[PDB]
Design a binder for this molecule. Structure first.
Ligand SMILES: NCC[C@@H](O)c1cccc(OCC2CCCCC2)c1
Ligand SMILES: NCC[C@@H](O)c1cccc(OCC2CCCCC2)c1
Ligand SMILES: CCCCCCCCCCCCCCCC(=O)O
Ligand SMILES: CCCCCCCCCCCCCCCC(=O)O
Ligand SMILES: [Fe+2]
Ligand SMILES: [Fe+2]
Lengths: 510, 510
């Protein structure tokens, strides 16, 4: 949990327009930047929160800004450029809001505002949002290369900002199809050197709980042998979605509703046999954005999730007007929102009818349960790993390359305090011990883990976070490097300009 | 959690017949019994697990044995006597099992085998089970005085072994009525000196979820202004219950079944206005035996519970044959049982329709939620206070006289390890810190708190537990005194004879 209030309102700087740079700045280092840290931290976020006098309304509406911190020989640079999307380019051309964003209807066509994340496919990097358009970008210059329409290649209406990436470069993602949820597989770059997106395929399909209302989907789980998909009660109303949007004046946010009675349905597919498995896993209602990690342990799937307890769409609390309120009002507004909680669910793969009415979760080191009912639904209860009053352990990251999809012990996260990011966290998922890093009037980003090259242990490395530190006596922002063992500070690299909120990203080793 | 295995099987001594004493034994003290500790620890349990060659089958079948440790001027005695119930007396007379017990059908009429608890009404003390018969006993000699049939006074078929006792001596309890659950109020002893049981009344009534199947009920919650009842999916099948029992050969255990679809329904009544309040609180399935404590905080009820996650009846795992198995087999048997978990539920008293779809739990220091649905059910999620793999924090006790029904911080409990009692626990319900007391091959009882008589703080006192320590190198049993602050040992009082399992009891100040 956080141990801090924010009466000064410095968090408002997360949602304030900035300018791009024409070339990299030097970042003033204090402490010691590890000499083995060589490469680029690449992150996305909104950077332009109004076009002239026309305002963007929602957290996810501001125009995509691609950020880069470079690390070489203990020295750091910072650079940023707006992504030249249709949304941005046409807004600059016409000097108004042209494309409808998530929560901002444009007055008189799908957004490609790639403000959320960035990931590799073959030798390329793509910025994304959650729509059918991803944007190829140059990871060294931050130039925008190409718009790619996933619909030209596979049958999906969108795809998440959280694809899983296997060690050979294979990319998996999930997307709505208008009804199913399709898993897309993009193969690694092959000898022929042609673009791996042109070899995309749907490998497996998950069914939908309601023919006319698909669930919103933000991420999914992957193990060597299984794919896990969590169907939440946040639904997309397709009657509102597929009508004339500039008639009645709609945006994406206007098309969501909550199903009060379904709870959550969890789904598994066989990854290698490409086959949906018909186990009716059921539990109580929550929103889910980020899976932490998933793994196989005997005949069981361990599914670790950042949950929000309730069926109301958490995105309702993320209009900019609310996030720009003063501290007492920010807290008041979040009182009735769903409560964040890290939960471990355990999914049995061997369902014996003879165990009807009992708990199937026979593993020795969890309190998670799974009850086989007579209708063959399997009712799940979680083991809670972390729970704090409006204190979210969010934007989770692990040592992904070596532990993604596998037995693991540690996760790192961004700590939200009534939705305001004010700390960095580490959770031991076996023991539930936590570690916190926190300074007054400091607003960090998702922490990203980078392994030490001679690491023996899961947490032998650092985490990198971009921190916004407003109010003079300090420089506006900095790159924070923390030791992954105990979250003690190793270094920081201060810059002379503001940085707004960023959502996701990656470290690119060079 | 426990840190101990039990390969020696010493826990079997908890379920072995003992002989009563004709007068008190001296208990050899080591360490220093507090000089302000003056009075008697009174506890009930089974003491006779077979009649001749006819065996009792279930944990709750053995014949009631009343235990007493006396404390005066740093010296301790121990005494025990079988309760002269109809079950016991007739078994001694006829030299066989005459009355059907909970899980033991008698070959050829309700049991009054008062093996569970003991409590005060006016100037009297009554041993109880959960039936319509309670047994008046003498707290100084341990003589049995008389049988009382609650049906002669109030309309109930039974009553729990966990009445609440207000500071003036008022007694509240709950019982099934064959359909409702009735709250019985027994007033304090008045000037006229007549037995307060003759002034018993039903003050309020809780409705039943199923006309033909009432829920099993073990305890309930009480605050200055409210009564809380938790209706679980463990049901009593009245078609099986009310048929001729010695025809098809039935016992009490044979009449229980689990409703797979209702989950848990929570109920509140206005204590002072004597009125059921019609709020449809709903959550997922669990068994519940013991409420820890209940209290009012602004317009909310805080409801702390020892839960078992699942709908299967936990009492199915408590046949003596299973509890007498070897350790590896005990653990194996408990793998599919419900998982124990301490949970805090929070019940809003102000339901505004304008908040439909949202979390009503606006308190600042909980993660518990309560969601108002369109059908007006209020779906609850808990804040988990303690969770360990088959490690139950059970038989909870608090500083009851000063904190029962009120804001509080500390609970004490008996720690079960795959149902085997092997430690004593303390839980801070605000911070979730725990403290443990544990020795190898030692099997404690429910801890009971005694305040230092001039204490101003909540945990300024001691806990008392009766501990079975088999295997030579030690005396068979002892009374354990721990400091309530940190569970560090203060003293023990060893006795030369075995003591079997005991369930509940009290400290009687003299
Ligand atoms: N990560 C926050 C949401 C944001 O990425 C976003 C911004 C703009 C549109 C949008 O749409 C999501 C839908 C796309 C089509 C298929 C259904 C989901 C989603
Ligand atoms: N504490 C463990 C259960 C035990 O007290 C017990 C032993 C024997 C009979 C019995 O009956 C409970 C029913 C009484 C009538 C009303 C329904 C519950 C209960
Ligand atoms: C760094 C963000 C701070 C302000 C917003 C915090 C509220 C986050 C709520 C949970 C996560 C929602 C998903 C956002 C990340 C994404 O777009 O992938
Ligand atoms: C000291 C008891 C040890 C053996 C039984 C442990 C299993 C207890 C399960 C939860 C509590 C059930 C109620 C027992 C006490 C009572 O009858 O009131
Ligand atoms: Fe995300
Ligand atoms: Fe009990």
């Amino acid at each position: 949990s956080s141990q801090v209030e924010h009466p000064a309102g410095g968090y408002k700087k997360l949602f304030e327009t900035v300018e791009e740079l024409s070339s990299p700045l030097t970042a003033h280092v204090t402490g010691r930047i590890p000499l083995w840290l060589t490469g680029s931290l690449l992150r996305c976020g909104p950077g332009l929160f109004e076009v002239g006098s026309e305002p963007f309304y929602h957290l996810f509406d501001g125009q995509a800004l691609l950020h880069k911190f470079d690390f070489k020989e203990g020295h750091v640079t910072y650079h940023r450029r707006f992504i030249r999307t249709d949304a941005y380019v046409r807004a600059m051309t016409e000097k108004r809001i042209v494309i409808t964003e998530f929560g901002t209807c444009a007055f008189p066509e799908v957004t490609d505002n790639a403000l959320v994340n960035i990931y590799p496919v073959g030798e390329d990097y793509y910025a994304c949002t959650e729509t059918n358009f991803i944007t190829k970008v140059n990871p060294e210059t931050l130039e925008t290369i190409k718009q790619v329409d996933l619909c030209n290649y596979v049958s999906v209406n969108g795809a998440t900002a959280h694809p899983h990436i296997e060690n050979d470069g294979t990319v998996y993602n999930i997307g709505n199809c208008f009804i199913a949820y399709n898993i897309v597989k993009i193969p690694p770059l092959q000898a022929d050197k042609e673009d791996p997106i042109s070899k995309s395929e749907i490998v497996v399909q998950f069914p939908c709980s309601d023919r006319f209302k698909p669930s919103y989907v933000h991420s999914f789980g992957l193990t060597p042998n299984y794919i896990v998909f969590v169907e939440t009660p946040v639904k997309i109303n397709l009657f509102k979605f597929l009508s004339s949007w500039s008639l009645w004046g709609a945006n994406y946010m206007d098309c969501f509703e909550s199903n009060e009675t379904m709870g959550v349905w969890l789904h598994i597919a066989d990854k290698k046999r490409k086959k949906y498995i018909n186990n009716k896993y059921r539990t109580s209602p929550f929103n889910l954005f980020h899976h932490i990690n998933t793994y196989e342990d005997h005949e069981f799937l361990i599914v670790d999730l950042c949950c929000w307890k309730g069926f109301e769409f958490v995105y309702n609390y993320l209009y900019l007007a609310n996030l720009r309120e003063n501290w007492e009002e920010v807290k008041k507004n979040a009182r009735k929102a769903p409560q964040p909680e890290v939960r471990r669910y355990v999914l049995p793969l061997n369902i014996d009818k003879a165990d009807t009415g009992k708990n199937l979760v026979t593993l020795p080191n969890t309190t998670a349960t799974a009850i086989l009912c007579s209708d063959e639904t399997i009712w799940l209860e979680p083991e809670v790993l972390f729970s704090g009053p409006r204190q979210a352990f969010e934007f989770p990251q692990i040592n992904y390359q070596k532990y993604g999809g596998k037995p693991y012990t540690y996760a790192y996260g961004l700590g939200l305090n009534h939705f305001v990011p004010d700390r960095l966290c580490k959770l031991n998922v076996k023991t539930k011990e936590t570690w916190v890093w926190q300074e007054p009037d400091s607003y960090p980003s998702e922490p990203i883990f980078v392994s030490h090259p001679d690491a023996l242990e899961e947490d032998d490395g650092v985490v990198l976070s971009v921190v916004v530190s407003p109010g003079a006596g300090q420089k506006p922002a900095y790159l924070l490097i923390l030791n992954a063992k105990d979250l003690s500070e190793v270094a920081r690299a201060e810059v002379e300009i503001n940085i707004p909120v960023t959502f996701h990203g990656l470290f690119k080793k060079s």
